[model samples]
Target: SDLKSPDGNFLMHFSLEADGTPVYKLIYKGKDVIKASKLGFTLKNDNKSLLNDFKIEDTKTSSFDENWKPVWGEVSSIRNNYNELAVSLSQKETDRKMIIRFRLFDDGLGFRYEFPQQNNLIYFTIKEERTQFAMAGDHTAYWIPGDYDTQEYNYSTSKLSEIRGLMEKAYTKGNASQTSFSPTGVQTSLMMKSQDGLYINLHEAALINYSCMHLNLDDKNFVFESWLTPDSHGDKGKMQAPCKTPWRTVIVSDDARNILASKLTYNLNEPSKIQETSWIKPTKYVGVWWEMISGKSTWSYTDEFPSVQLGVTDFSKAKPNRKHGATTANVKRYIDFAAKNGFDAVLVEGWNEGWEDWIGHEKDYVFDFVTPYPDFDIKGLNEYAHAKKVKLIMHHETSGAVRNYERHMDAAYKLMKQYGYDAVKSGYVGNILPLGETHYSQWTNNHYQYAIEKAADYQIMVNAHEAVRPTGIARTYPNLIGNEAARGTQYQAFGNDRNNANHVTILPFTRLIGGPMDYTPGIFEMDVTNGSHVNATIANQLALYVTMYSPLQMAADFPENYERFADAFQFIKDVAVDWDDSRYLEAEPGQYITVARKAKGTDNWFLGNVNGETARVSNIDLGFLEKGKKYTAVIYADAKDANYKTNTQAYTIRKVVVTSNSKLSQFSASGGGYAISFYPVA
Candidate 1:
C-alpha cells in the first residue's frame, strides 16, 4: 500500500515480501530518499519467531488536522496535521500481534511499533529491533561513533562508504564501549545528503523508556538498520501489552533549510503532560562555569582531595582552597554580574558538597544532595541573588549515580524549593549507578524521565549534561530546559586538537534539529594563554546565540572576558532566549547555516550566519521582516584576516538601516561567522 503527503511531496510505500517480512520505502519530490528497507523486531524469549512467521493482516489509513501551541519553541504554534497509516501484522505462532503505524507529513515520515493487548500476546523482552534504512545511493553523511555510554564526540563528515574508516578515529576521541558499540555502528540523529540532492535525516523521537537507538550500516550495500543498546543481560528492552515504542523518524527534503524547519519530530510526541506550564520559563543565564573548564579554577574545595571515596565525605568541613569558584563571595560576584546584565539567572557549579569526591570512582552516595561546602554559603547566596532579581540555577552532577540520585531526588528537590531555585544543571559523568548500565539503557532512560517528573513537582527546570541525546520531549515536559547531549563549547578548552570552527556550523543541521542545545556560545577569549585558543573567530561565537535555540543559554565565558569585549558582548546581552518565529535563510549540512528569528513578543529580529572552512557570501532577503517598518541593523562579522589558525579573534561591528525588502550582503570569513540584530526605528 502507498500513502501521499497532503501536498504530494512525500510518498511512502509499505508491503511484505514473499516470506511475509515487512518492507517499506520513501520518495520525496519524485526522488528516492529511502530505498526499499525491512522493518521488524526480534524477541528474546518465546516471542522469538516474530521476524519470520508474520502475516500482513490488514491496513488502515487516516488523516489529522490540528494546531497546537508550545510552552516554548521554534515557533509560537505548530500545525499538527498529517496522514497516518496502520499496517497490522500477526505471526503464525502464538504471541504475534502488532501494528506499525506510519505518520507521513509533507516533509517526512514517523513510524512506531504498537503492541495491542491480545490473548496470545501479553509481555515480553525484545532481543533486538530490526528497523532498517536502506539508502538510495552513497550519500554524504555527518556522524559520530556509536556508544551506549556516550555521544559526546565531535562529528565527522564523510560519504556513506567512509564511515568504517572513521570508526577507529572516532574511538580515539573517547569511550567507545566494547560491549555496546559494533565495529560498524554510528549514532543517530544520523544526517545525510544524497548525490541526487535530497536531504534525509534518521532519528528516534520521544524516547520514553527504551534503549537509545544507533545505526549499523552495511558498507557493502548502504543498508542501515536500527541498533539498540542492550542491558548487562543482553536484552534490548522490556514492554507490557498495549504499549507503544518511541517513534522512529525519517525527515526528507531537497533543501537543507526546509529540513531544519521540519516539526515532524515534535509533532510525533504527545502534548504537554503538565497543565500548569507557567512555571516553565526558559531563561538566559550566565554562570561561574567557564573558569573551571578553562583550567583557572577548580570544582573541588580542598585542593588535596583524593580521587577515591565510597562513603559520604564532608566537603563543607574539609580544608578550603582559595581556588574554589562557587564560594559565597564568588557566587555574589556572578550574581551581581548577571543582574547588571539583564540575565535571568546565575549558575554556580561547585556550590554543592560532592565535587571534591565526584566522578573519579564508581560508588553510591559520594555526597548528600543537601549539603553545601563550608566555604560556600548556599542560603545566603540564594537570598542575595534573589534580592538582585537573579535566580541561581542549582547544580547536581550525579556522576551517573542514578540509584543514588533517585534516592536523593525528593530531598534534593525539597532543597531547591527551599532555596528559591527554579532550574538545575544536572550532570551524569562517569559510570551509571546501576553498576553495569549504560547511559542510554532502558533503566537509565527511565531515570532521566523520573528526574524531570520529580523536578516538575517542584516546578524546577532541568538542563542536563553528559546525558542522552535529546529527542524533543521538551514539548511534553516543558521543563527539560536544555541538554548538552553532544560535544559543546568546553571542548575548545581541551587544547589544540579538539574544537574547530566548522563544529558550530554542522551542529545547527545535526544536533539542533532534534531539539535545543546548551551550546553556551559567545566566547571572546580565544587566546587564553600561550598554548590555548578557541578555534573560531570571535564572530562565529557571537553568531551561535542566534543559530542555536537553547531556551537556557549561558554566557559561558568569564565575566572578565565579557568586560574586555563589551562592544561585542552587547549582542548576547540583547538577544532573546524565547522566540515566536524562525526562518532558515540558507543551510547546507556540514557546511553553513543562516537563520533569522523574530524575538518573542517584540518587533526585533536577530539574524545569524556561520560558514565552515570555506568562505562564502550570502545575499539575504529581509522579506520575513515586517513590511514598511524601518529597523537599525547592528552587524558583527569576522575581519578579512580572521582565520581560526592565524587570527581567531579579529572582528568588526557596524550598523546599517534595513527594511522588509532590503537585501544585505554577508561576507563570512573562512572558518568564521556573522550576526545582525535588527532593532525597530521609529
Candidate 2:
C-alpha cells in the first residue's frame, strides 16, 4: 500500500515480507526519509514472534476531519485531520488477531499495534518490541543516553559512528549519575539532521500505561530498533485483551521550523476527558526554589546534611535549620513578591515534613503528606497568600518512592484543596520505590497518570518534576500543566555556566515538540563561581520567556536578584504565558530559532530570537502585527563586542516605534538572543 500527505510532500509505503512480517518506508520530496523497516513483537508465554506466520486478514481505510479543543495548549484548538489505514493480521498457527493502525498527516504519521479480544490470545506478556526505523544513511543526531530512570543528560550531538562512550559520559555528566543506563541505546525524542537537509525526530505519543520506548543504534546498517524498558519480571509490557500500544511517531520536514510547527503529537491524543475545564488555567508562578537548586539554602528541617529523623509524631520541638528556604518568613517574602509583580502563584518545595531523610530507600516512609515542619507555618502562609489574592502551590518530593506518595495522595490533595492551593509540583528525584521497577516501566507510568487524573477530581492542577516526559496526556487530563522531563536550569546552579549555548537552542525542536516545559527560564544571576560565567548573555535569558514556551514559567531567580536589573526584569514580568496564536519565524535544529506569539487575549505580541555559540543576523518582520497600526517595540540585545564567555551579562536595551511596514535586521551575539514586546498604540 502507498500513501502521501495531503500536500504530497511526504510519501509512505507499506508492505509485508515473504515471511509475513510487516514493513514500511517514508520519503519526503523525492528524498529518502526512512528505509524499509520491520514492525511487531514477540509473545513471552508461547516464546513465539508475533511476526512469524502472520497473514493479512483484512485491510481498511478511512479519513477524519474534526477539530478539538484543549483546556490549555500551545495552540488553543487543533484540527485532527488525517488519512488512516488499518491492517488486520492473524497468526496462521494460533489464529490470533491483531490490528495495525496508521494515521498519516501533512507533516508526518503515527502508527501503533492494537490487540483485540480473542480466545486464542486472552492474556500475553510482551517479551520485547520488534519495531525498527531503518535510516537511509548515517544521519547526524542530537541525543542523550537511553536511561529509563532519567532524561537528565545534556544532549550530545554526533553521527552514528561517532556516538560512542555516551553510557559513561551520561553517567558522569548527567544530573542523575546514580541512575542505570544501557550502554547501547539513546532516549527519544531523537532529533536528527540528514545530509539532505532533512529534520527527523522520533518519539512516541499518548504513552499511557506502557514501558517507555528507547532506540537501540545499529550503526552498521544505519538502523534504529525500538526497545521497551523491562519490568521486574523481565517483561517489556503487560496487558490484557482489547488494549493498544502507544503511537510511535516519526516527524519529518525539510525545514526545522516545520518540525516545530507540526501538531501530530497532540493530534494522536484524545480530547479533554475533563468536562470542567474552567479551572484548568495556566499560571505564572515564582518559587522559593532556586535557593535550594543553587545550594544557597537547604531543604532540611534540622542541621542534617543527608539524613533527618522522620516517622516522628511531633515536628514542632525539632531544632530549626536557619538555612532552610521554605521557612514561613522566607515563603512570605516570595508570596509578597509574586503579588507585587502581578504573578498568580508561588511554589514552596520544602514546606512539608521529611525533606532531610529524602534520598534513599528510607524515603518510602519519610513523609506523612500533611505534616508541617518546625520553623514553617503552612496554614498561616496559605491564609496570607489567599488574602493577597495569590495562590500557594504545594510541593511533594517523593524521593523516588511512589508507594509512599500513593499511600497519601488523597490526603495531600485534600490539603491543597483546604488551603486553596490549586496547583502541585510533585517531584520523583531518585530511583523507583519498588526495587525492580523503572521510572518508565508500565507500573510507574500508570502511577504518574493516575496522580494527574486523581488531582483533577479534587480540582487541582499538576506540574510534575523529575517525572516521565509528557506525551500529550494533558489532552485527556488538562490538569497536567507542565513537566521537567528534560535537563533544566538547575544545572547552572551546580557550577559555572552549566548550560551549553546550543542546549536551550535544541529543545523547541526536540523535548518541547510533544508538550510545554517547566524550564523556569528567567535567571539574572548567572555567575555561579563567577567563573567563565553563563554561556548565554543577559539578553538571551530574557528571550527564553518567549522562545521557551511554558504556561508555568518561573521567575527562576531570587527577588533580590531581580532588583539588580529591574529594567530587564520587566520583560519576564510582562511576557504572556498563554497565547492565542504563534508563528515559527525561522529555525535550524541545534543552531537557531526565531518565534513570535500573540498574547491570548490582547493587542500585544512577543517575539524571541535565539542562537547557539555562532553569532548570526536576521531581519524581524512586523507584518504579523495588525496592518497600519503603530506599535512600540522594546528590544533587548547584546552590547557591541559582548560574548558569553567574557562579557556574558553585557547587554543593551532600546525602544522603537514600528508599524506593519517595518522590517528591522538585528545582530545576535554568540550565545545571545533578543526579546521584543509589541504594544499597539492608538
Candidate 3:
C-alpha cells in the first residue's frame, strides 16, 4: 500500500488484514522509508546501506488446522486508560517518524514491535491449539546492545488463567500486598499465606512478552499463577516480587530487540520513554545497623526496623569512639572485607535518622542528608571506601513517607556524587499512608522513575528495597541495581519454618523472570536456634550465589562466615555480575528448579539448582559450548546421605570435560540442591 502526500517529499500508506494487525509503509523521495506502527510495537526502516538488516524471521509454525496455514485474526479493538500516547521517528519535526497511541488492553495476550518498511521483518508471533511457532534465528527485531538475546517464551491454559484470576482476587480482598490491571482489564495479584490463615498481599507489575500462568495444586486443589521471563542479561537481573507479592514487572527499552524479548509491560502512553532511565543495578552487597539497637535476635524488631542489623553493640558506645550512623570506621570493616573477597559494593542501613534509642517514633526517623550520628561522617566514609576500591552503597529508610524523602533526594544525590558514591538503597518499610494514599500504583512507579532520573543527574545509582515490584523500569534506569521485594533468605534464619529451600526454588519461576532481586543471600550460617551462629552447610550457601541473580549481588554473611568455608569460595569467587547467555534448564514451581548462565567475554559457565523433598535429575546439554574446545566442569552436589534434619553438609565435587554436543547429568537430593561452574581448559 502506498499513497503520496500533498508534498511529494513524504509518503505514507496503511493496510491491514481482517484480523486487525495493521501494517504501514512510508517513503521519502520515491525511496522506501522506515515507518512506525499505531500499536506501539513495530517500527519501519529503509537504510539498506546498514551492515545488518534488522528484520524478524518466522521459522516454525503451529496451528490447529492440518493445512498448517498461518492463522490471522481480528484484533477487535485497541483501548487504554490512565495513559497518553505519542509517536515520532525523531523528537524534531523534520526527522520523519511514526508513532502510535493506544491503551494497554487488560486481557490482551500479545503485543509486537512492527517495522513494516525494512525487509518486512515479522518479529512477533502467536500459536494456537498447542501448535509450535518458530522465529527466524537470523534477524533481531529488538536491540539491547549489551544483552545477549531478544527472544521470549510464553505458555497459558484455562487452568493457569484461573489461578491468575484467584491471585488477583486475593490481592483485591487484602490477601496479597499488590495487584495490577492489564490493558485487557484483567487484574491479578500474588499473595502470601501463613499457617494461621493470615494473608499478606504482594505487589504486582506487568511484563512485556511473557504472561503469568496459573497452575492447579495437585495437593490442595488451589490454583496459583507462575511468572516467567527471558534471561536477557544473564544474571537474571530483570525480576522482582515486592515483599513476597505475586505480581512481578519487568523493565524494557524501546529498542526493537528489547521490546520483543522483555516481559514487563510498556507505558503505551509513552513508548519511547520506556527505557529513558537505563539498567537497574539490583545486587550490590550491603551492611546494616541493627545489632546496635535491636541486639542480635531477628524476631524482636518492630515495624520501624523491618531489617535485621549487624555490627556494633550500641550507638552510645560508638558515640565515644566513632559516629554511630555510617561512620568511616564501621563501613571500613565491611568495605575492606568486600574488596578482599571480590564484592562490588557494601550497603549500610541505620546510617540515617533517629534509629538509636528512639526507634519507633515516626518523627524520629530523619530524612535529612546530614549525618544524624556525630561520629558517622558520610563524606569521610565515602572517600575511604573509594580509596580502598569499594563502593559505599548507602541506605535511606523513609519509614513510609514519600514527600519527606523526595525533599531530600536532590541534596542526597549531590552528596553522593561529591563523595564519589554511585548507588543509594532506598526503603519504604511501613504501612501505606492514611486516607487512601496508595503506595503501590502507577504513582509509585513515577516516583521511582523520578528518583532514578534525579540520581542520574548526579551520576549516582539506585537499589530500592521494601518497595513495589518492578515492571521493566530497569531498562530505563540501569542504575537501579536490584530490589528486596520478596520474603528473602533472612526470614528462614529468623523463623521456625524449613521453607527456605522451597521458596528459593520457587522464586526463579515466579519473581526472577521480571527483574533482579536483592535477596541478600549467601548466609552460610543457617539453623541458628537460641541466638547461636551455627553455620549452614557451606554447599547450601554456595548455591545461593548461583541460584539468585542480582547486578548488585551481596555476600550477606559476616566476614567470619567466609573464613569458615574457604573450600566453597570457588563458587563465590567465580560468579559474575553480568552474563552473556542464559537458559532455563528445568522448572517446577514450589518443587525444584535449575538454570544455567554463561559469561560473554570468557569461556565460562555457571549452573544452579534447588529442589523440594522429592529427588530429581536433569540432563544438561552442552551444545552451547564452543565446538572444538574442551572444558572442565566443576560439580557441587548434595551428598546422597544428607538430609535436611541432619548432615546438611553431605555433598561432593567432581571435574569433567564437556564439548559443544555433550550432555551432563544433574542430580538433586530430596530437600537439597546443587551448583556448577565450567571453564575452558588450557
Candidate 4:
C-alpha cells in the first residue's frame, strides 16, 4: 500500500502479512530517511532518519517462520487528518498479540502498544498529555486501568483494586472523594513516590528494551539496550528464559544515523553483536558507596553521631573519629583498603556539602568535586591510589532535582580528570517537581547522556545511584558502569526489617535482568553491635559478590573488617568483577539464588549461593568447566559450630581438581551462603 501525508513532505510504503505482522519501509522523496520511534517500534525513512522507504530486499529470512508461514503483519494507510502511520504485528495465531501504533502530531511523534485483552490480565497504556516541539524523545509510558484496583508492578505487586477499595472505604467514612487522574488530562507513567514523586520518561532504542528513560539531553544518538522481560513460559507452562514475548526493546538514534542498523533488543542471554562490539567495554570490578550525607547512614558502620545528625549549620565542626562519618580519613581508609585488598575501585558518600541537614534544606546542598576537604586531599589521594594501581570513585547526590548538579557537571568531570580519577557516582535523591512533569523524565534521560558524553570527553566513567532503573543505556554509554535501581542491602542494614536477606536474593530475577546493578556487596562481619547497624553475616556477603553482577564491583566493607578476616579476604580478592560468561544457575525470588561467572582471559570461575533460611543441599555440575582441565576450588561456607550466628569465620578452604564430568554436592545452613572459586591450573 502507498501512503502520503497532506503536506507531501512524508510518505510510507508498507505490506501486511497474512498472520498480521506488518512490514514497512518509509522514504521521503529521493532520499532514504530512517524512521524510528521514541515510544514504540519505529520505521526509518532514510539511512539517516528513522524514516526509511519500505523494501522487501532488506528483509531477513528470520522475519518469516521456518514452515514458510508469514508472520502476520500490516501497515496503516496514511491518515491525512493527522499525518499518522501505524505498523502492527503478531507472533502467533493466538489472540495474544503485540501492536505498534504511531501517530505523527505537529509537535512531534507519539507511539504506544495495545495488548490483547484477557479476563485477568494487566496492560500497560501511555498517553502524552503534552508534547514538546524539540523532537520525538519527550514522552512517558504508564499503565491505565478503568478501575483503581488494577494491579501494578512495583518492587512488589500492589493490588490497585484492593488498595482503591480500602481507600474508598476510608474516604467515604471521612466524607472526602479520592482524587485521581482522568483520561482527558491524566499523565500515565510509573511514579517513584519515595524518591520525591519522580516519574520515569520513556524513549525508544534499538539496542535495549522499550525506550531508555532519562532526565536530561544525554540520550541523543546513543545506541542503548536493556533487558525488559528476562524469562518467559510456554503455552504448556514450561519455564524458559526467552519466550516469544515482544521482548520490550528500544533504541535511540540521531538524525544522521542508519535506523535499520541501529535497531537493538534487550535479550536474556547475550547482547547483540553491535552492542558487544560497539558499546560494551572491558571494565574490572563493580562497586557501590554509601553517600554518607544523604540520610543513607544505615549501610555503613556509623556510631552514635551519624553524619546526617550534623546539619549544614554544623558543617564546620569536624568529628574525625566517628565511624563512617564521611570524614576524609574514613573515606581514604576505604580507598586504601580497596587498593590493598585487590579491589578495582571504591565509592565514597557524603563527601559533598549536603549532609548538614536533609529534611528542610535539601536543594541548598551542593557537592564541589573540584574542592578538597579540610582533612582529605582528593587530588593527592587520587594520585596515591593510581600509584597503587587503583581508581578512586567519587559520588554526587543530586536529590533528583538536577539543576544544581548539571550546572557543575562539566567542571566536576574536568576536575576528576585533572585528579587522575576515571569514574564517578551521580544520584537523584529527592523530588522537587510537580506530578506529570515531562521535563523531569526528559531531563533525566538526556542529562544522563550528556553526563556520559562529558565524561567520555574527560576519559572518565559513571555509576548512577538513586536514579531511574536501566534499560540498556550501558550499551550506548559504556561509561555507565552500574546503578542502584533496586531495594539493596542498604535497606536491610537501616530499615527495621531483618528479612531483607531474602529480598536481596530476589533481585537477579527482577532488577538485574534490566542491567548491571551497583549493590556494593562484600560486608562481612554482619550482626555487629553498632547502635543502628543490621547487616548480613560474612558468608552472605561473600555470596553477594558472586550473585550480584556489575561491570564495576565494590568491596563495600570498612578496611578494618577485611583486615580482621584476611582468610575471607582471600576469596574477595579472587572474585572477578568482569566476566567472559555468566549463567543463572537457580532462582526463587526472596528465597534463594545461585550464580556462576567466569573471568575474561582466564579459566577461573566463581560460583556463589545464598539461602533465606531453610537449610538445603545443592548439587552443582562441573560440566561448564573446560574439558580435561584440572582446577582448584576454594569453598566458603557457614560453620555449623560457630559461636556467632553471623560468624562467616567458619569456612573451610578445600582444594580440589575437577573435570567436565565432575559434580559436587554442598549443604548450606539456614540463613547461610556459599562461594566457590575455580582456578584452572597452568
How large is the C-alpha RMSD of every model relative to the true structure?
A: 1.7, 1.8, 15.6, 15.6
Assess each prediction's global lDDT (C-alpha) against the native: 0.84, 0.82, 0.45, 0.46
- Candidate closest to the true structure, highest lDDT: 1
> In candidate 3, what are the lDDT values of residues 1-682, reduced to their tens digit?
3333333443544444344334444343443322332221111232321112112122121211111110000011112222212221221211322222211122111222222232222232211001011111111111000101111111111221243344332222221122232211211222222222221112234422232222112112221222121121211111121111122221212222222222323222122222433323323464643323123422112233333232333333432422243555666778887778777777776565345322233332245654445445776777777877777776776655567678787887777767766788787655333323334433444466677778766666777765644554554445656666555655444433424345665455435544667776665555453453322344555666656666666766666656786666667777765665665566544555566677545668877777765667767667767788888888877777755556665668888888777887766766667778888888
- RMSD versus native structure for model 2: 1.8
Q: Clashes in each model (backbone N, CA, C under 3 Å)?
A: 1, 0, 84, 89
Per-residue alpha-carbon lDDT of candidate 1 for residues 253-362, written as tens digits (9 for 90 to 100) = 87899888888888988889989998898798888888888888888888656652434555546677788888788877788889999999998888766676675477
- Two-way TM-score contest, 3 vs 4, winner: 4
Residue ranges of candidate 4 with Cα displaced over 4 Å:
1-328, 358-360, 433-440, 528-535, 640-650
Worst 10 residues of 2 by lDDT: 170-179
Better of 1 and 4 by TM-score: 1
Candidate ranking under lDDT, highest first, comes to: 1, 2, 4, 3
Of 1 and 4, the candidate ahead on lDDT is: 1
The runs of at least 3 residues in candidate 2 whose Cα sits more than 4 Å from the true structure, single-residue gaps closed, are: 165-167, 170-181, 304-307, 311-314, 529-534
Better of 3 and 4 by lDDT: 4
Candidate 4 residue-wise lDDT at 104: 32
lDDT of 4: 0.46
List where candidate 3 sits over 4 angstroms from the true fold.
Answer: 1-108, 111-286, 289-329, 357-365, 496-500, 529-540
